[PDB]
Design a protein around this ligand. Structure first.
Ligand SMILES: Nc1ncnc2c1ncn2[C@@H]1O[C@H](COP(=O)(O)OP(=O)(O)O)[C@@H](O)[C@H]1O
Ligand SMILES: Nc1ncnc2c1ncn2[C@@H]1O[C@H](COP(=O)(O)OP(=O)(O)O)[C@@H](O)[C@H]1O
Ligand SMILES: Nc1ncnc2c1ncn2[C@@H]1O[C@H](COP(=O)(O)OP(=O)(O)O)[C@@H](O)[C@H]1O
Ligand SMILES: Nc1ncnc2c1ncn2[C@@H]1O[C@H](COP(=O)(O)OP(=O)(O)O)[C@@H](O)[C@H]1O
Ligand SMILES: Nc1ncnc2c1ncn2[C@@H]1O[C@H](COP(=O)(O)OP(=O)(O)O)[C@@H](O)[C@H]1O
Ligand SMILES: Nc1ncnc2c1ncn2[C@@H]1O[C@H](COP(=O)(O)OP(=O)(O)O)[C@@H](O)[C@H]1O
Ligand SMILES: Nc1ncnc2c1ncn2[C@@H]1O[C@H](COP(=O)(O)OP(=O)(O)O)[C@@H](O)[C@H]1O
Ligand SMILES: Nc1ncnc2c1ncn2[C@@H]1O[C@H](COP(=O)(O)OP(=O)(O)O)[C@@H](O)[C@H]1O
Ligand SMILES: O=P(O)(O)OC[C@H]1O[C@](O)(CO)[C@@H](O)[C@@H]1O
Ligand SMILES: O=P(O)(O)OC[C@H]1O[C@](O)(CO)[C@@H](O)[C@@H]1O
Ligand SMILES: O=P(O)(O)OC[C@H]1O[C@](O)(CO)[C@@H](O)[C@@H]1O
Ligand SMILES: O=P(O)(O)OC[C@H]1O[C@](O)(CO)[C@@H](O)[C@@H]1O
Ligand SMILES: [Mg+2]
Ligand SMILES: [Mg+2]
Ligand SMILES: [Mg+2]
Ligand SMILES: [Mg+2]
Ligand SMILES: [Mg+2]
Ligand SMILES: [Mg+2]
Ligand SMILES: [Mg+2]
Ligand SMILES: [Mg+2]
Lengths: 319, 319, 319, 319
């Protein structure tokens, strides 16, 4: 092909720009021209497309968010929608599409190949809940953002000998909470994928307190419930002075981490290598520390799980 | 004197340890011995006092929180309380007291001099709401913590073209929100000390949006009300996709900033110079960029204000 | 006036962009139009001038360096040079000039007023060696960059029980080294403005070692000499395993600190208030915690000094 | 077994403490008791051994360096040395040994099993040059330290349109330089494991300059030669204003990254699981994203390589 497109959809993640940057550079090295779609699917339909030159991606490697923006397009679910967007691609002479984003987003990449547009999905979410990849672009970054918070909370919490319930993102996945909790020396990690017993959780807290622990840190994936309900519950049952912190969206921004920058680079490139080689309908990732690619349709069938053994470890080191 | 005490009271702040460290080193340089009171006023009464050696304060300069801990002692308000604590000092042969903390805390330093115990207050709060000082120990740190958050929020907010209401600490003071808002390129700063008109606030937001601004950042000092109420209000009136972030206690911890480290050092030292020179009942600070000291009783009479001109500036650069 | 110019000269500093941003916003609020000079004096002559619109300064507040670039123009020392540049201003209809930069730079602002061009200097250097100001834009940032280094060096140095000689910037001023050394718990601070005796320096190191200190940290302002010579000297005399680190230019970049962001904002604004009020030939600053302005010619006469008492403190807390 | 030892040898790395912490907690969970050896091999001989209690490892997770210290013991190469140390273990009733460190260090773990002391090596180096593992504890941290530097250098370098030669650690491995260079948008990466042609390197720089690039960033692994020689060489051949930065030991310290914290946790635990299960003479690691363990003797036979394809990528995205 001679012309490809690139867009960002779903929630933004740190590292989207390094991704955009490798697609752009990878394609040009190869003499292919790159077009940017602004506002994701929404601007695909609206024809918000501009050519990206070698230098338009200069000085974005270290930046958070996405320079192409992102938007929610519920009109792309529609036949008409996929038609209108498909028209826009042709009007511009764009033959392939690199889509960096979530699972919601991969679904649209799929619908596009089915109508003849070769697309490759690049996993961009802070959640790490994308099949076909061990790691998603932006997860490392979010992790470091969270332990940055925990580190701070531990200082205040030691000072006043208090218990903190910290609510982290990851709507349906416990990755953030699990790796965070571990890296942060947390005393409890409540994730979606594991059963917890509130009485055992309490027993364990009490026992650590008695054994002379100054603070207590509890990580709750938003996926489980609210930081406020667990705070309430725990304070009632232990009589310990409790506080709740909802990190929120700070999790979503920042200058991506080295890993995130390398990961995004490598995957965004790889995505281009596939469009050129005529592959299409695939999604890229990293598995067992190697670059892999799947069929979107089949990677989507698959389910997201965590290392249950890591969760155990959590429980053993928290003594 | 030959023996002094040092304690931390009120909410902990980044830089308390560098403070503790200068009191300890300053006193020993001078051949005076230093005693630590653990758990603030509460442990004063309980006699939780240990001698601090030159090296006990080694490797704390860069740390957040307070190695002496802090506690709320509502029994120190009481005559008996001040008696019991006064007894504990004598039992240990402690003649002077450096108290690092809030205004609540300065009140107790006052009650102590009145019963004959020379005390000097060291302003330790992230709030910056202590009379006699331009700057309180830990404020610089909190500031940097907050703009760290704003920086991140701006990335996500630009990405999705959204409006963010960010709630910062400072119970009755607008310092955090004001300096933050300014350093952060915020579009609105709602502080306690200034009147705001919600209709004007709205008008100004709308006008920036129209003039092509991608995101919108609103800083609300907890002192004004809730980030959630302003979010609600603003979304209703503009129809802009809004999100709210409550930074909370991350504001309170972390490795203190260079300024905070210098400030704490200089003030903690100065406090010792006063106890030795027999001054007592005073509080230290920095005014017009010089070390000053006041009478606690008179500095407390005084009121905390902000630079209203800085607030204006806020409004002019936000166009 | 209706049209002003703005430029950055000398070595770049973190906070130049927040400066540029307040000049730009301050001027427009006032209905004045702002022109940017690229490449400092050099591009003034070459006529590298572009109009700056309200949004061209959007999203630069948190960034390091200067979006207008900077260059060394030894042709501006020349009559012809100042003529050619003066011509360029007129050709564009620019009546005033905000110059953000060093002392070298202030000299040119001076030469410009003398030929009739109202100019105001904004102190932008990481060195803090500019008369008329307590603090220069970028100094807070450099400070935090350095203690960030020290913090790291302390970890490795404790680990292996070693002595580190750390060379910091500040060509003729000891500010960086002094505040750094203090905030960093350094054992020695060699600055230009103070006499040191290498034998005493040695004695003091030895004595701390014996008293059980694991590491040893020595800060040397480049202004004094080389980190390598002091390393050599010290190792020879103590037999302690020594290492040298030259921080270099990392000191010069980064996302400016809250203070730096506020300071730059306030000063860049103030500079505009002066051009409008017809003042000219002045330089802005912060003194005794208040915005002040001087005559460039007289502020330049003045000399840069440090708080000698802060240096003493250094020596007392280092026991 | 009922009693194990743990020590840190070689150059310290961020994450050693999280390692120490999992060995300590993992062993106690299991009812085994843990002994700490201070000063690595050197203190093994000298009998510098103290029992580690559950709480002695509290509040070290987020810290750099090693709380057990490290030292170079050239007397441990010696039969006598291994005898004396072996004696010390027995004198204390220590049956197993977890050794966290470099390859030099793994060699001693080997010599110890051969004389009957079960030992497991934990890869702790910032270099990433340890066989049996994809990743070594502390590498992620060093990486982030370096791109932190690059980010800063890019600001100053863009400002003045200059070329920077940045020298990074990794004595014989190009990992730091390679991942750094990539994550940092570097224009050249000179590593040991790849051939470079200085004329091509020059050609490529010139070509980027002409194509309008403001700065230029060159990463040189110390393993290749000196930042100063490449600076010299490059400046001579391009006439571009060049600067050199030697990051040095800042690479070695800091609060470990989330990955480093998880990695160290998981590996330090695993090491204990092996001593209990009677395995011995093994080394742990992570391969293809899974915990693996090897025979020290055989993992040492193996050689350290990099992803040559990642190096290519480097070259393609740098256009
Ligand atoms: N064509 C161009 N016009 C203006 N600036 C450019 C151009 N190409 C590159 N730059 C800038 O030069 C610097 C180095 O460029 P480049 O190597 O391509 O960027 P990066 O390392 O971010 O990919 C960056 O600030 C970049 O944005
Ligand atoms: N079945 C679908 N067909 C086409 N596009 C879809 C489909 N599902 C989602 N998308 C597209 O992807 C955009 C991003 O999807 P969304 O679910 O909101 O992302 P996320 O799951 O990451 O939140 C959608 O709004 C829409 O345009
Ligand atoms: N008496 C001591 N025993 C153990 N460690 C000590 C002792 N004195 C100092 N240290 C350690 O040596 C290092 C340097 O000491 P010092 O200069 O006094 O600390 P700081 O710079 O934090 O004030 C730090 O890790 C400190 O904690
Ligand atoms: N009037 C008082 N007399 C004695 N001690 C007091 C008085 N007011 C406050 N304090 C002491 O200082 C502690 C810290 O006071 P507090 O108000 O809670 O701090 P803050 O105002 O910073 O929250 C109190 O709990 C108490 O022991
Ligand atoms: N006219 C414009 N065109 C494009 N982007 C703009 C424009 N004006 C503002 N923006 C962007 O909108 C966001 C908020 O704008 P603004 O408040 O003016 O910036 P800042 O807070 O940095 O001064 C930033 O990303 C800014 O760069
Ligand atoms: N006497 C002078 N007359 C005019 N311009 C001058 C004079 N001295 C310096 N400058 C201008 O300012 C630029 C910045 O000066 P320079 O000394 O290099 O900055 P710094 O002192 O901060 O390094 C100079 O190269 C030159 O154009
Ligand atoms: N026995 C103890 N004595 C004193 N402080 C302790 C003790 N046990 C734990 N702590 C402190 O309590 C806090 C929480 O403890 P812990 O969960 O064991 O630490 P971490 O999360 O670092 O492993 C930390 O500051 C820790 O150092
Ligand atoms: N052949 C060996 N036998 C025993 N111990 C050894 C051997 N080689 C190295 N060591 C031990 O490990 C310590 C750490 O080794 P060293 O090579 O200096 O670490 P690194 O290679 O990581 O620098 C040595 O000083 C020594 O006690
Ligand atoms: O950004 P929104 O629409 O508020 O949604 C928040 C969600 O986005 C994420 O931050 C990123 O996918 C999730 O963890 C979180 O539940
Ligand atoms: O720490 P607590 O008891 O929750 O109180 C929170 C208060 O403490 C501070 O963080 C520090 O004084 C205030 O800004 C805030 O209102
Ligand atoms: O940037 P150059 O030309 O190498 O000069 C380095 C000088 O610039 C500064 O970093 C900033 O003025 C000084 O501390 C240092 O001596
Ligand atoms: O710490 P030393 O003895 O100066 O040795 C420096 C070496 O240690 C490391 O920093 C860590 O192994 C290497 O990259 C570097 O060559
Ligand atoms: Mg969705
Ligand atoms: Mg814990
Ligand atoms: Mg109170
Ligand atoms: Mg703004
Ligand atoms: Mg000069
Ligand atoms: Mg020290
Ligand atoms: Mg060796
Ligand atoms: Mg580049």
């Amino acid at each position: 092909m001679k012309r490809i497109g690139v867009l960002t959809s779903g929630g933004d993640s740190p590292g989207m720009n390094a991704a955009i940057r490798s697609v752009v550079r990878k394609a040009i090295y190869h003499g292919v021209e790159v077009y940017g779609v602004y506002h994701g699917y929404a601007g695909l339909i609206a024809g918000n497309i501009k050519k990206l030159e070698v230098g338009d991606v200069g000085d974005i490697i270290h930046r958070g968010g996405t320079i192409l923006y992102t938007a929610r397009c519920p009109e792309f679910k529609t036949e008409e929608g996929q038609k209108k967007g498909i028209e826009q691609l042709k009007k511009h002479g764009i033959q392939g599409l690199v889509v960096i984003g979530g699972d919601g987003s991969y679904q649209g990449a799929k619908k596009l190949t089915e109508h003849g547009f070769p697309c490759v999905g690049v996993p961009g979410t802070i959640d790490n809940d994308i099949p076909g990849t061990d790691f998603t672009i932006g997860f490392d970054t979010a992790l470091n953002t969270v332990i940055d918070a925990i580190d701070k909370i531990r200082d205040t919490a030691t000072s006043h000998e208090r218990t903190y319930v910290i609510e982290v993102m990851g709507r349906h996945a416990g990755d953030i909470a699990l790796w965070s909790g571990l890296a942060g020396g947390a005393e409890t990690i409540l994730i979606p994928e594991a059963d917890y017993d509130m009485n055992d959780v309490i027993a364990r807290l009490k026992r650590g307190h008695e054994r002379g622990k100054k603070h207590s840190i509890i990580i709750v994936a938003e996926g489980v419930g609210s930081g406020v309900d667990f705070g309430r519950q725990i304070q009632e049952a232990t009589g310990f002075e409790t506080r709740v912190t909802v990190l929120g969206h700070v999790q979503r921004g920042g200058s991506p981490t080295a890993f995130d920058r390398v990961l995004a680079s490598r995957l965004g490139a790889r995505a281009v290598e596939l469009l050129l080689e005529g592959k299409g309908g695939r999604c890229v990732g990293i598995q067992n520390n190697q670059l892999v690619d799947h069929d979107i349709a089949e990677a989507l069938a698959n389910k997201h799980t965590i290392d249950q053994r890591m969760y155990a470890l959590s429980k053993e080191l928290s003594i």
